[PDB]
């Protein structure tokens, strides 16, 4: 039959009724007197739910433009479909109704950057949540900027000192690289990041104003109690006057935890772009990926491996490539990134873990089986590398550190045979004891980062065999006695002279003879 | 004449053309955008609508934004005028030395040459690396793979390859940095400034390498086609000017990764472990253009990322078949500190036949492989006993294989900046006799 071709209506859209309502309703002779809702810079909500609003209209909206609902809550126009717009919501979707008006703002998403953000605790969009008033000495920059290219960068030569001994000697970090902190839960990741920020406070007073590193802590997905503990700690130590604290927490909406590291990176790019140095720490980048996975699954984008989208590599790569050491024609500033990734039972073959391992330069791989062997910070030395190498290692620390790497490498390959205590060799037992003293050397309390000169003196104390008489159970006191019983005049000249000078290696050969040790 | 943007979902834009749709792989310029946005047509959707991938970020695209058709694919400047430059995916200069001189403006998409223009000349390339010159010898004109995970030494191996063969070579060379770090792209650019391979200013014409950079920050439409841009720049030298080129591709894995990042938004339902259905076909369509024809030769060195040291993952497993010589790197030998961390019982070549290198090189390489496999088959015993019950029969094999393991390592000149040891160049007869 010639009517069977029109049997099932072939529909090319889902919101067809909102287009036939645009033309049937002004056909009432009563209803042509400007009785039509507009669609150019305004938009009706079609359907709210789970933090997504499908918005009819907004014919002039840009992709990624910050839009605003008439309820007050903002949003970001993310999907631009042929008929509607998929607007993720920067707050609770419960205040957004079907049929509400959506106002576009003309702006891609903005954050306040400047010196006015120092000392303040902001959320993922720059609103301060600490309660000391608004942000005053700031200007509003973009949150999604292009990473600086090949010409805009230069090589990473100068070092950034963490204060942790196992990462200033074995895995050294230069101003301008990105060092992943990867491990399981409760292993030392936030502890290593906090020791880095506290040691930047310690180094910022002994250097001129062109060497100061202003840290930025991005806390994505944590509790507000953890962020309150960290702000209490950064106030107690005094590191808040250099630190920005961007906290999109767990109760906050998934687009805020998605856009929090871009917010903190744009705040740190102010210090990068003005010749100073920054230290951005994206804490739990894996929770950013989880928030982005939620935000993209509810936008009906097709999932992939572990239900993550396709562009979750691009999500982290276009964020981490904004940590650059700029060239001398752009001020020469830098930005060091410290993404933190949580793995499940040491599995680095997971999706996001392989992505951010391949993106970053190094990795500080922490283990929970070395965390409970007393070796804390729990750095798995065999897997923790830094691909700048010794180019941005402290000289003097570099003079003992390659041998430290070598002796721990020998101690690791002499291990898994030390269950045979009867096997008296004396060709392996010396390195099996020396590696035990070196493993006991790199242990450190948390919240107390040691300056770099005391570190390289205390590794020069153990790589030469000065502690070979000391029992393995009290080298953590022997190192404190070495540091507190040598002169406080050597550290002043090793900090200034920048390497172990030959007028210092024979001075402190002998200054480590008149120190008394807890070991006999 | 123009079409207009109808749909923007990340890096995938649908452009609606009122009559006379552009062809597939054609290039489209978005007029009105701030930066130069270029879309490449991926498929025809069927309602006067093409679905594109974008060569830059789509943040700021309005629906209804006009889009002009260029009538051709992405055309890049090629020729002598690119020698010593840094090019974009779309052929723009990003070295800030001004515009690029033009022998021609070639489109980046072609077919693999034919079956008839294949040159069957298996001839050796001497590198200067003992494990490369010994166990997996390289071919002049054939494709080379540096397989490894993250941090095992692929980029350092490719840098020692660059200053060992591309430093002293007759024809030109092309470094296509596909989806890697901007930092190491800058380090390689500055190291090739400082050693004279790229000359700035008015000595620019005497430079002998072209950089094409498609690094990690750039959206996957750019990372998917910067390899084809670099290959077109090499193909001009191979075909038109008829010479021997080298194509150093850094992490060809990022090409397949970039196709996978957009493939779900292209309407393709997902394949196995996270990749597109057309993984092997895209990898073959890229790789089959890199051949020594009757006109010239392209001796490519392709770094390949292997995700989490898993060679069974299909994106490193498919590109084992498009190569003549594979140099597989391992984390296990890197745990021993031995560098270059080449696995001697996993690195192959078609140049390990005794009809191409001779019986002295083949028999020394097979003797090394035999003693190393004997050692790997005795490590299960000597990790529970400790070399006391073998009774001087298979003990000397262990104490020769443990010397061969150390002697396969070699200091690199490009690794002098890391470690304070000078670099070596070991001649082929010298390593053959020494092994």
């Amino acid at each position: 039959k010639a009517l069977d071709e029109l049997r099932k209506p072939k529909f090319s859209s889902k919101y067809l009724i909102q287009h036939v309502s645009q033309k049937l309703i002004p056909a009432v002779k009563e209803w042509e007197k400007s009785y039509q809702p507009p669609v150019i810079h305004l938009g009706r909500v079609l359907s709210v739910g789970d933090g997504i609003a499908r918005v009819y209209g907004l014919k002039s909206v840009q992709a990624g433009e910050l839009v605003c609902f008439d309820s007050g809550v903002k949003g970001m126009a993310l999907n631009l479909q042929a008929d509607h717009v998929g607007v993720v919501v920067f707050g609770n979707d419960s205040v957004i109704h079907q049929g509400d008006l959506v106002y576009r703002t003309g702006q891609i998403v903005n954050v306040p950057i400047g010196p006015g953000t120092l000392g303040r605790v902001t959320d993922g969009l720059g609103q301060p949540i600490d309660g000391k008033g608004p942000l005053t000495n700031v200007r509003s920059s973009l949150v999604e900027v292009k990473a600086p290219g090949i010409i805009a960068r230069q090589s990473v030569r100068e070092p950034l000192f963490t204060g942790v001994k196992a990462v200033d000697a074995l895995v050294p970090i230069g101003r301008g690289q990105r060092e992943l902190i990867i491990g399981d839960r409760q292993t030392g990741k936030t502890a290593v990041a906090i020791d880095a920020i506290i040691h930047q406070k310690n180094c910022n007073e002994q250097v001129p104003k062109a060497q100061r590193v202003y840290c930025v802590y991005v806390a994505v997905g944590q509790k507000r109690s953890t962020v309150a503990q960290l702000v209490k700690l950064f106030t107690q130590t005094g590191a808040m006057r250099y630190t920005i604290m961007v906290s999109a927490t767990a109760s906050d909406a998934a687009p805020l935890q998605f856009l929090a590291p871009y917010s903190g990176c744009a705040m740190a790019e102010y210090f990068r772009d003005t010749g100073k140095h920054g230290l951005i720490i994206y804490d739990d980048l894996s929770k950013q990926s989880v928030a982005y996975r939620q935000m993209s699954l509810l936008l009906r984008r097709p999932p992939g491996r572990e239900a993550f989208p396709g562009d979750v590599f691009y999500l982290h790569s276009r964020l981490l490539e904004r940590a650059a050491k700029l060239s001398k024609e752009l001020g020469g500033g830098s930005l060091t990134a410290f993404p933190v990734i949580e793995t499940q039972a040491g599995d680095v073959s997971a999706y996001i873990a392989t992505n951010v391992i391949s993106i970053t330069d190094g990795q500080i791989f922490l283990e929970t089986e070395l965390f409970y062997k007393g070796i804390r910070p729990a750095l798995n030395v065999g897997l923790s590398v830094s691909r700048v190498g010794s180019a941005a290692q402290f000289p003097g620390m570099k003079q003992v550190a390659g041998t430290l790497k070598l002796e721990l490498a020998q101690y690791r390959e002499v291990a898994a045979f030390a269950q045979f205590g009867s096997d008296l060799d004396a060709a392996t037992q010396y390195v099996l004891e020396r590696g035990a003293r070196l493993t006991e050397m790199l242990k450190q309390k948390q919240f107390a980062p040691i300056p770099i000169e005391r570190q390289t003196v205390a590794v020069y104390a153990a790589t030469k065999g000065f502690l070979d008489k000391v029992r393995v159970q009290d080298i953590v006191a022997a190192e404190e006695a070495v540091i507190s019983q040598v002169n406080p005049a050597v550290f002043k000249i090793l900090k200034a002279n920048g390497k172990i000078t030959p007028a210092l290696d024979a001075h402190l050969k002998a200054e480590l003879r008149k120190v008394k040790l807890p070991g006999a | 004449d123009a079409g207009y943007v109808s749909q923007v979902i990340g890096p995938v834009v649908d452009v609606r053309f009122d009559g006379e749709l552009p062809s597939i792989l054609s290039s489209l310029e978005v007029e009105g955008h701030s930066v130069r946005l270029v879309l490449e047509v991926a498929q025809h959707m069927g309602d006067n609508t093409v679905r594109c991938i974008a060569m830059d970020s789509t943040d700021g695209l309005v629906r209804g934004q006009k889009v002009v058709d260029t009538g051709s694919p992405i055309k890049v400047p090629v020729g002598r005028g690119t020698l010593g430059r840094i090019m974009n995916v779309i052929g723009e200069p990003v070295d800030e030395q001004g515009p690029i001189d033009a022998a021609d403006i070639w489109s980046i998409h072609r077919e693999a040459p034919e079956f008839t223009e294949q040159s069957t000349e298996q001839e050796i390339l001497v590198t200067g690396i003992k494990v490369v010159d010994l166990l997996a010898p390289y071919q002049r004109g054939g494709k080379i793979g540096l397989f490894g995970g993250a941090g095992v030494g692929k980029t350092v191996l490719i840098m020692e390859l660059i200053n060992n063969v591309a430093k002293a070579h007759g024809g030109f060379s092309v470094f296509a940095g596909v989806g890697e770090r901007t930092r190491e792209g800058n380090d390689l650019y500055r190291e090739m400034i400082e050693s004279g391979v790229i000359k700035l200013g008015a000595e620019r014409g005497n430079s002998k390498c072209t950089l094409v950079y498609g690094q990690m920050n750039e959206p996957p439409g750019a990372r998917a086609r910067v390899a084809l841009t670099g290959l077109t720049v090499a193909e001009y030298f191979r075909d038109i000017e008829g010479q021997d080129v080298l194509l150093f591709v850094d992490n060809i894995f990022r090409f397949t990764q970039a196709n996978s990042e957009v493939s779900a938004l292209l309407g393709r339902i997902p394949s196995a472990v996270g990749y597109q259905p057309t993984l092997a076909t895209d990898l073959g369509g890229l790789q089959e253009r890199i051949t020594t024809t009757t006109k010239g030769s392209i001796t490519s060195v392709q770094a390949v990322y292997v995700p989490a040291d898993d060679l069974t993952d299909p994106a490193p497993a498919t590109t084992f078949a498009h190569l003549d010589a594979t140099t597989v790197l391992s984390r296990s030998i890197a745990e021993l500190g031995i560098y270059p961390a080449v696995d001697p019982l996993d690195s192959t070549s078609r140049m390990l036949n005794p009809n191409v290198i001779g019986a002295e090189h083949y028999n020394v390489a097979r003797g090394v492989q035999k003693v190393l496999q004997d050692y790997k088959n005795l490590q299960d015993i000597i990790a529970i006993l400790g070399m006391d019950e073998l009774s001087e029969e298979d003990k000397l094999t262990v104490a020769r294989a443990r010397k061969i393991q150390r002697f396969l390592s070699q200091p690199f000149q490009v690794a002098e900046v890391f470690t304070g040891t000078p670099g070596k160049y070991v001649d082929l007869a010298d390593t053959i006799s020494g092994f």
């Binding site: 039972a345 040491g346 599995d347 073959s349 | 898993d310 299960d380 529970i384």
Partner: peptide
């Protein structure tokens, strides 16, 4: 993780 068990199986199988 899944590669640990298959290699550990061959370890215990040769032991």
């Amino acid at each position: 993780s899944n590669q640990a068990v298959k290699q550990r199986i061959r370890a215990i199988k040769n032991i």
